[PDB]
Amino acid sequence: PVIHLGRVLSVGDGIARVYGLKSVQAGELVCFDSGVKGMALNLQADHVGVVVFGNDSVIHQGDLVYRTGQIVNVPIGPGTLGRVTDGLGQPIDGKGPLTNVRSSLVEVKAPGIIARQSVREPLFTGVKAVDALVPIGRGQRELIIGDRQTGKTAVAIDAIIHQKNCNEQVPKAQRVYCVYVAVGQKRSTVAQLVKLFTQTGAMRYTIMVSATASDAAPLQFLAPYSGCAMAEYFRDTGKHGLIIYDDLSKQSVAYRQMSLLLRRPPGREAFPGDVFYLHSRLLERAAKLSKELGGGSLTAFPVIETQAGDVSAYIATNVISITDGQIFLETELFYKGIRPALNVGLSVSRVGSAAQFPGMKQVAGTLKLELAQYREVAAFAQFGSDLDAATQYVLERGARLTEMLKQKQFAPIPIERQTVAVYAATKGFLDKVRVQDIVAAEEAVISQVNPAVFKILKANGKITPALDAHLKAELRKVKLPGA
Amino acid sequence: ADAKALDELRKPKFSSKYLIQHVSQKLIPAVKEWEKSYQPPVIHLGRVLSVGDGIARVYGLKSVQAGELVCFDSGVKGMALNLQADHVGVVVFGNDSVIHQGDLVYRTGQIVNVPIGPGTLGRVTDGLGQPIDGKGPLTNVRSSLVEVKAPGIIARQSVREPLFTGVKAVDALVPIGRGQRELIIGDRQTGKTAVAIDAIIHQKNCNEQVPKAQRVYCVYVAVGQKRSTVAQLVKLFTQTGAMRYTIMVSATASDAAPLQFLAPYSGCAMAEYFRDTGKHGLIIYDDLSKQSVAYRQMSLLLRRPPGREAFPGDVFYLHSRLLERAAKLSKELGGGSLTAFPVIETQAGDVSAYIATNVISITDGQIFLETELFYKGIRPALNVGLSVSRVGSAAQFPGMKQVAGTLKLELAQYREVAAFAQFGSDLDAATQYVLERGARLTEMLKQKQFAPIPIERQTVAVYAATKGFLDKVRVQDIVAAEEAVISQVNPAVFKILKANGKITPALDAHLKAELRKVKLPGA
Amino acid sequence: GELPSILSSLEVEGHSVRLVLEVAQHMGDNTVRCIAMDSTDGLVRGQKVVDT
Ligand SMILES: Nc1ncnc2c1ncn2[C@@H]1O[C@H](COP(=O)(O)OP(=O)(O)OP(=O)(O)O)[C@@H](O)[C@H]1O
Ligand SMILES: Nc1ncnc2c1ncn2[C@@H]1O[C@H](COP(=O)(O)OP(=O)(O)OP(=O)(O)O)[C@@H](O)[C@H]1O
Ligand SMILES: [Mg+2]
Ligand SMILES: [Mg+2]
């Protein structure tokens, strides 16, 4: 093939101006002679503005830029599963090249009106605060929003670990293949996280697209799109995908950097005017396709870190108007030991109840209702003024449901062992058990109840009238602590 | 376009000569016939390319250094600040109305100098060193650069000798060491100049009592002030006698903005003569927040990229390379010192503003002066809760350090319960004693303008309030009860408190006895 | 020659999808400035654009 050259005119502030390259496409992946890739961003009348996927230190004026002939692509396919790649799909885990893979564009238009269908099948995260209150279907976009260190990743991590455990027990046609996109994080904490997914076995189904804090800002800008193209492989071939863009807060800061270094006029909090379209273009690709397109699905979990509980920030409110639901993780509940620190009053799932477990749909209806009154009572009974002994009843009942929704880290629960535990606490079987014992008490409930109740509930998907007759019997025969 | 097509035009490609051989024989008559329509081309000279708002872009000047004094043909001086590829951007020390497009600029070959030495002492110079007091040129003086690099880590020693302001609120609570940078920050009309004046006047009262090497030679830099305000300061320093040791560098408000920018550096070079020669200097940059506005004006007119509040990116570097020249040199460099007092004017107390934040980071503590304490009768209005001296942990008078540590605690307990018990109706027997002692301690610290006190006499007035001896005068007589103690006490305890430096236990017992035969005006 | 009117729609030849431009400005040297109704990724600086 004839190679089209181009000189670098001027490099610096992360963008090279490139003379030549007369037939280069807009958005084309160009390659510098130092090996570093670039994206032809602004085709001008006399140069090409190239954003540089890496360090701009290795580029000089007069370097040769070659065009690759194609728009910016990453390798997608089954050879990406198990592999830790950077923001351009190149593997950084030292396990050789990505074989068994095929390159595809990172910037694909999301499927239209006629290509979707309604989100029906559930996606279980294994978090019983989530899977009972904020239920998540396949094809949904669920924002995990909270402050710093409020368990934002803990919710994303246990969702990925739970999909490994579900994948061993289901047919191949309904198996969720996870992608974790780590943008702007510390290369330390991605290395702890790859070890965690390796020793659990979750890296059999997980791709890890890491653009850390030392990477260039166009690489952090691109890694959500590189990760979404890798997960759109499973969406388009009839399979199911999960994606976690951890800190879309940090993608937009990397994109704000490229806009201000391109001398573009800034808006709210110095953000570009198209910082909405940055996340809008990305999160619309998490769809549930129709039966004529395969029926595949991609579920997104964007993560947004707020500052002081300010959900009315610019990037925060941008994604709240993009995503379907919202998992708001609160810092006051987090320091009180309530973990996962779910703000039950604010956390919602738009699609939600149309796509949850029909056992949990008929148990957690009275869970979110009684937790509503416990929020209502302990917003007005803060003072310790007086007691109705029914408001003090729901104060002691709502304190039991809160401990019932506490959960440890890296131990997701199956949905059948979840809905029995909510059945055990809403139907009064966990009455008079002290609130410092319910972590131990429904560890006793799940362990002492016959395993056949979990298997009948898993296969029927619903608490049949023959089952709640039998499940109430098997909860009467439970050695609760303290009695 | 490109370069590889344009680098091949240095080689001749004409291959025909009906133009090159003709007009080369016809160029020099056409050029010479408009010889009087020409100006001679400048290479090492400069020609004024454009001028306006005190900024002259200058074609030529091939050999100017950055920061060099250039001179226009009007006699007005300049300063080559940004040397660019086509022109020199100079700032004009004076009026640019006498500067025209096409004027000749001459480099002087000198980075900006000022007269420093013993002959500049007692004179009022402008922001560039030239005397404006109208008594001839400076004699017995020598030139020195205004952009001296500050002394390093290894040419400094620890700031241990106290420099006395003469203000009880300063010398007890926020004590100043001899080579220290202390900010005097606060709003307008809160007494920031009056703190700095009293520190200068007190040096004159101390210079006649110390053996010639402990003498402090003050420099007052007035930046962006009125000329009538500096005429009052000259009258106040002359009628006191303080301008035997005082220099006044005055760049007033009608002066050019490069002169107001350059006046803190010009005064510091005059003050560094005393630091470098083993003497001790003291410099007050009054309105350092008016230097930074002058440097912002030159930067935005020189088309430098603005930052927050449109200040240049090097406005921290402006104040840090000025204020780090205030040092306490080691004993191998003579042991001299220079202590700075920059004055920042805030706007409604907002010390999170950009220049106030920068100078708070540079200096070794602030003197805050609130305007609510000012009208509450506390003058000097030193806010104790916010004014810090981060050197003052054992950098003061040892006799005052006996009693200022208790004053720092007994006023601190008062500040929590002051805004608590604004009422005096229903009070505990423990918190009311803090409110009676803390109101006794507040009234003792305030003092009148232009009367700085010796340190041995404000030690005994804090000792008269830290101890008993004043728990019976109401609040309205402690101003009179303190000067009762200064009048009535045998003044030979001042001679042995000041000479020893601390309250010896023999003097401690006579101090209790002398503070009992006083006639307090509580009656 | 014969620049299109402002707000008139143009068509790009040989794109991946139908790329419709809409003339926003007359830039001044026989150049119009258009806004694309689809993506411009894959546009080359010689591509023929026809005026509707
Ligand atoms: N359910 C849980 N139970 C107990 N500890 C938890 C739980 N979830 C998270 N944690 C702990 O809380 C801490 C913060 O959680 P996490 O790392 O998810 O925070 P984050 O929101 O990602 O914060 P960062 O800004 O540091 O990324 C960690 O020590 C983690 O182990
Ligand atoms: N200790 C004091 N006792 C009585 N009056 C004082 C005292 N200090 C200052 N004043 C009076 O308060 C007024 C303001 O003082 P000063 O000029 O020192 O403040 P400033 O901070 O320099 O104000 P500005 O910066 O606006 O000039 C002066 O007129 C002065 O007379
Ligand atoms: Mg995290
Ligand atoms: Mg003043």
Q: CA of A276, closest CA in chain C: separation in Å? A: 17
- Can you say whether the dihedral through the CA atoms of A59, A61, A63, A69 is positive or negative? positive
**B touches A (3+ CB pairs < 8 Å)?**
yes
> Residue A150 annotated as binding?
yes
- The Cα–Cα gap between B309 and B298 comes to 14
* C21 vs A contacts (CB less than 8 Å): none
H-assigned helices in A168-216: 187-200
Q: Is A174 exposed, middle or buried (0-12, 13-18, 19+ CB in 10 A)?
A: middle
CATH, residue C43: 2.40.10.170
Which ligand number lies closest to the CA of residue B165?
2
Catalytic residue among B160, B308, B390, B474: B390
Q: How far is the CA of B236 from the centre of ligand 2 (A)?
A: 14
DSSP B467: S
Residue type at A276 in one-letter notation: F
CA angle B277, B279, B281 (to 5 degrees): 110
Q: Give the count of domains, chain C.
A: 1
Which ligand number lies closest to the CA of residue A126?
1
Of B166, B78, B225, which is closest to residue B447 (Cα–Cα)?
B166
> Residue A138 annotated as binding?
no
Place of tokens 């006083």: B518
Q: CA of A12, closest CA in chain B: separation in Å? A: 17
Q: Which residues pair with A207 in a beta bridge?
A: A179
**Is any ligand 1 atom within 6 A of the Cβ of residue A156?**
no
Cβ neighbors of B195 (< 8 A, separation 6 or more) are B165, B167, B170, B184, B341, B367, B369, B380
Other CB atoms within a 10 A radius of the CB of residue C51 amount to 14
Q: How many helices (H) and strands (E) does chain A have?
A: 15, 17
Q: What is the DSSP string of B117-165?
A: SGGGTT-EEETTS-B-SSS-S--S-EEEES-PPPP-STTB----SEEP-
- The Cα–Cα gap between B263 and B127 comes to 4
Cβ neighbors of B92 (< 8 A, separation 6 or more) are B51, B54, B55, B56, B72, B76, B77, B78, B99, B256, B258
**Is any ligand 1 atom within 6 A of the Cβ of residue A154?**
yes
Place of tokens 């997960």: A231
- Residues with Cβ within 6 A of ligand 2? B 188-194, 345, 379-380, 448-449
Tell which phi-psi region holds residue A452, choosing left (phi > 0), alpha (psi between -120 and 50) or beta.
alpha
Question: A361: helix, coil or strand?
Answer: helix
User: Resolution for this model in angstroms, one decimal place?
Assistant: 2.9
- The Cα–Cα gap between A124 and B393 comes to 62
CA angle B315, B319, B323 (to 5 degrees): 170
* C45 vs A contacts (CB less than 8 Å): 22-23, 43, 45
> Residue B36 annotated as binding?
no
- Chains with 3+ CB–CB pairs under 8 A to A are B, C
- The Cα–Cα gap between A361 and A133 comes to 9
Write down all domains in chain A, each with its CATH number in brackets: 1-70 (2.40.30.20), 71-356 (3.40.50.300), 357-483 (1.20.150.20)
CA nearest to C47 within chain A: A23
* A71 vs C contacts (CB less than 8 Å): 41-42
Question: B261: helix, coil or strand?
Answer: helix
* Token pair belonging to C24: 């926003």
Buried b (16+ CB within 10 A) or exposed e, A215-251: bbbbbbbbbbbbbbbbbbbbbbeebbbbbbbbbbbbb
B207 and B216 Cβ atoms separated by less than 8 Å: yes
Cβ-defined contacts of A93-98 (< 8 Å, 24+): A93/A194
Cβ neighbors of B143 (< 8 A, separation 6 or more) are B113, B114, B115, B116
**Residue C41: which domain range?**
1-52
Q: What is the DSSP string of A420-454?
A: HHHHHHHTSTTTTS-TTSHHHHHHHHHHHS-HHHH
> Residue B194 annotated as binding?
yes
CA nearest to A44 within chain C: C45
**Is any ligand 1 atom within 6 A of the Cβ of residue A250?**
no
* A24 vs C contacts (CB less than 8 Å): 44
Active site amino acids of A: 350
- Judged by CB atoms closer than 8 Å, whether chains meet at C44 and A71 is answered as no
B86 touches A: beta carbon within 8 Å: no
Catalytic (active site) residue B457: no
**Is any ligand 1 atom within 6 A of the Cβ of residue A151?**
yes
A400 and A425 Cβ atoms separated by less than 8 Å: yes
C36 touches A: beta carbon within 8 Å: no
Cβ neighbors of A479 (< 8 A, separation 6 or more) are A444, A448
Phi and psi at A378, nearest 5°, equal -80, 10
Size of chain C, expressed as the number of residues it contains: 52
Other CB atoms within a 10 A radius of the CB of residue A431 amount to 12
Of A410, A385, A399, which is closest to residue A336 (Cα–Cα)?
A399
Sheet with A65-71: list strands edge to edge.
A8-10, A15-18, A48-53, A37-43, A28-32, A65-71
Phi and psi at B245, nearest 5°, equal -120, 5
> Residue B291 annotated as binding?
no
* C39 vs A contacts (CB less than 8 Å): 107, 109
- Chains with 3+ CB–CB pairs under 8 A to B are A
Cβ-defined contacts of B298-301 (< 8 Å, 24+): B298/B54, B298/B55, B298/B81, B298/B91, B298/B257, B298/B258, B298/B261, B301/B53, B301/B54, B301/B55
Q: How far is the CA of A365 from the centre of ligand 1 (A)?
A: 28
A328 and A146 Cβ atoms separated by less than 8 Å: yes
Q: CA of B2, closest CA in chain A: separation in Å? A: 8
Buried b (16+ CB within 10 A) or exposed e, A252-281: bbbbbbbbeeeeeeeeeeebbeebbebbeb
Query: Quick one: which H or E segment has residue B462?
Result: helix B455-466
* Token pair belonging to A30: 């160009």
B394 and B400 Cβ atoms separated by less than 8 Å: no
Place of tokens 């492989």: A233
- Strand A48-53 versus strand A37-43 pairing type: antiparallel
Buried b (16+ CB within 10 A) or exposed e, C22-49: ebeeeeeeeebebeeeebbbbbeeeeee
Which ligand number lies closest to the CA of residue A342?
1
- The Cα–Cα gap between B58 and B71 comes to 11
Q: CA of C48, closest CA in chain A: separation in Å? A: 13
Mutation test residue for ligand 2: of B192, B445, B450, the one with most atoms within 8 Å of CB: B192
CA angle A166, A480, A356 (to 5 degrees): 30
Biggest CA pair distance of chain B: 116
Task: Give the relative orientation of helices B455-466 and B478-488 as an angle to the nearest 10 degrees.
Answer: 120
- The Cα–Cα gap between B511 and B463 comes to 9
- The Cα–Cα gap between A66 and A381 comes to 70
Cβ neighbors of B158 (< 8 A, separation 6 or more) are B328
Query: Quick one: which H or E segment has residue B48?
Result: strand B46-52
Q: Which residues pair with A240 in a beta bridge?
A: A176, A297
Size of chain A, expressed as the number of residues it contains: 483
Q: Whose CA is nearest to atom 25 of ligand 2?
A: B188
Size of chain B, expressed as the number of residues it contains: 523
B267 and B275 Cβ atoms separated by less than 8 Å: no
Residue type at B415 in one-letter notation: R
Question: B291: helix, coil or strand?
Answer: helix
Q: CA of C47, closest CA in chain A: separation in Å? A: 9
Q: How far is the CA of B235 from the centre of ligand 4 (A)?
A: 16
Which ligand number lies closest to the CA of residue A157?
1
Q: Which of residues 1-20 of B touch A (CB under 8 A)?
A: 2-4
Q: Is A391 exposed, middle or buried (0-12, 13-18, 19+ CB in 10 A)?
A: middle
Q: Whose CA is nearest to atom 23 of ligand 1?
A: A149
Task: Give the relative orientation of helices B478-488 and B431-445 as an angle to the nearest 10 degrees.
Answer: 60
Q: Is B492 exposed, middle or buried (0-12, 13-18, 19+ CB in 10 A)?
A: exposed
Q: Is B301 exposed, middle or buried (0-12, 13-18, 19+ CB in 10 A)?
A: middle
- The Cα–Cα gap between A367 and A373 comes to 10
Atom of ligand 2 nearest to the CA of B197: 18
